[PDB]
Amino acid sequence: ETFLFTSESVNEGHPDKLCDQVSDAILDACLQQDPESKVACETCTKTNMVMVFGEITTKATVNYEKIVRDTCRGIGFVSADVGLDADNCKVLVNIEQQSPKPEEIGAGDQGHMFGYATDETPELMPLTHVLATKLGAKLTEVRKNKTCAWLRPDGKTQVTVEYQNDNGAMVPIRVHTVLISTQHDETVTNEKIAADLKEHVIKPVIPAKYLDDKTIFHLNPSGRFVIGGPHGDAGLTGRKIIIDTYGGWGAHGGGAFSGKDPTKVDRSGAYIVRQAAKSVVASGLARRCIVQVSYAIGVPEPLSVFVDTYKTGKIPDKDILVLIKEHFDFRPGMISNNLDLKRGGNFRYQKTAAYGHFGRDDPDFTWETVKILKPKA
């Protein structure tokens, strides 16, 4: 009859997510000056420290430490009390930096990537992940627009949804449980925190049709949460790959995104298969769809592209695959040009590094822009 699914997100001040954001801020800065930059930038944080390391090949002149402090400060790490003083903490820069036909650019590694789409939301994303990520984005918004000025940067959001399976399609019935644990200042009671999260975060984000008299709300269930981020903890880039993708739905190729230029198939491969899956569902060819691409090291053309519609396809899966191959170029150098991926600056990649790479209504997320696929007559 029904089944449950749960997805979680962490806020922009969670230490792992901080690392993802710093890594993508460094990518953005390199690409702004040099679109041909090669970037493999990781960030590690712990009490009073942020370290950036990895390999960059660029013509860009970048002040890495300045990017680190400005990113941390902008998230809200302005003091030891919040959990990191962006301007006084230790910053270590251990990046190894050097100077330096799109059809012929090979995959840099062997790997595979999955893209998922589902008609259950207008974002064509799983409702569990849409709600978890939009709750976190709304927490950040209401902090910065001073609706809830008592908020601090760290926290987590989690949603459990009850579903029916309708001949392979996922049909959300109701939100079972909402959990929010948010960092806050000393000046608000637990009562005020819970009341404000219901009014200013939950009510705007969760469609009323999914809430009922039995939905469970867990609002700061583990108690007071005044300090956060790096303090007494650690984070690394690429430690939240389920949050970055589909919140647990579908098979996983394992590759992490942030700090990688788009010559890296972990990122460009994942983006193109989301675009393909999303396009299949948007075009009415299936209610739900997973698209896989597999790359061989040094080869431009994928080993294989595969589609599965979970028996929801309006035409056979092999016939959808013909349309996907007609309209999508999986060669990595061609993905980078077609999806305009070599553009940075104006937070292009830093935006992807919290609250999910997918499901975003933002034209910079070019992989969210559907192609309208019509079978040939």
Q: Known catalytic residue: 138?
A: no
Q: How far is the CB of 150 from Cl ion (least distance, A)?
A: 30
Q: How far is the C-alpha of 281 from the C-alpha of 52, rounded, in Å?
A: 39
Place of tokens 């959300």: 172
- Based on the shown chain and the rule CB under 8 A, indicate whether residue 324 belongs to the binding site for a copy of itself: no
Is 14 a catalytic site residue?
yes
Radius of gyration of the chain (CA): 21
Given 233, 319, 329, 364, which residue is catalytic? 233
With CB cut-offs between 5 and 8 Å by kind, which of a copy of itself, Mg ion, Cl ion, none does residue 105 bind? Answer: none
Stretch that binds Mg ion, among 225-233, 241-249, 258-266, 335-343 (CB under 5 A): 258-266
Flag whether 266 is marked binding. Answer: yes
Neighbours of 251 (CB within 10 A): 13
Is 264 annotated in the active site?
yes
Q: What is d(CA 296, CA 298) in angstroms, rounded to the nearest whole number? A: 6
What single-letter amino acid sits at 91?
V
Return the residue of 54, 108, 111, 262 that touches Mg ion, per CB under 5 A: 111
Q: Is 376 a catalytic residue?
A: no
Which of 13, 14, 50, 64: binder of Cl ion (CB under 5 A)? 64
Q: Is 55 among the catalytic positions?
A: yes
**Residue 72 tokens, joined:** 């941390």
Is 211 a residue that touches Cl ion (CB under 5 A)?
Answer: no
Distance CA 102, CA 204 (A): 44
Nearest approach, Cβ of residue 266 and Mg ion (Å): 4
Exposed e or buried b for every residue in 191-211, given b needs 16+ CB within 10 A?
Answer: eebeebbeebbbeebbeeebe
List phi, psi (to 5°) of 81.
-60, -40
**Range 367-370 contact pairs with CB under 8 angstroms and sequence separation of 24 or more:** 367/271, 367/272, 367/274, 367/275, 367/278, 367/339, 368/274, 368/275, 368/278, 369/275, 370/124, 370/275, 370/278, 370/279, 370/282, 370/283
Token pair 């392979």: residue: 168
Residue 321 as a binder of Cl ion (CB under 5 A): the answer is no
**Partner touching 51 among a copy of itself, Mg ion, Cl ion, none, CB below 5 to 8 Å by kind:** a copy of itself
Q: Does 158 bind a copy of itself (CB under 8 A)?
A: yes
Nearer to a copy of itself, 110 or 369 (CB): 110
Catalytic residue flag (residue 260): yes
CB atoms within 10 A of CB 323: 21
85 is known to lie in a ligand binding site: no
First to last CA, the chain: 39
**Residues 255, 259, 302, 344: which binds Mg ion (CB under 5 A)?**
255
Q: List all residues 6 or more positions away from 44 whose beta carbon is below 8 Å from its beta carbon.
A: 19, 50, 51, 53, 234, 235, 236, 237
Piece of the chain touching Mg ion by CB under 5 A; list 107-115, 163-171, 333-341, 361-369: 107-115
Question: Is residue 72 a contact residue for Cl ion (CB under 5 A)?
Answer: no
Is there binding between residue 28 and Mg ion (CB under 5 A)?
no
Is residue 17 annotated as part of the catalytic site, yes or no? yes
State which of residues 153, 155, 235, 332 lies at the interface with a copy of itself (CB under 8 A).
235
The token duo for 93 is 């820069």
- Residue 52 or 180 having the CB closest to Cl ion: 52
Calpha distance 251→134 (Å, rounded): 23
Binding site feature residues = 109, 266
Residues near a copy of itself (CB under 8 A) are 1, 3-6, 8, 42, 44, 46-47, 51, 53, 94, 96, 110-112, 158, 160, 176-177, 179, 216, 218, 221, 232-236, 238-239, 241-243, 248-254, 292, 294, 296-297, 303-304, 306, 318
Residues classed as catalytic: 14, 16-17, 42, 55, 156, 225, 233-234, 239-240, 260, 264, 266
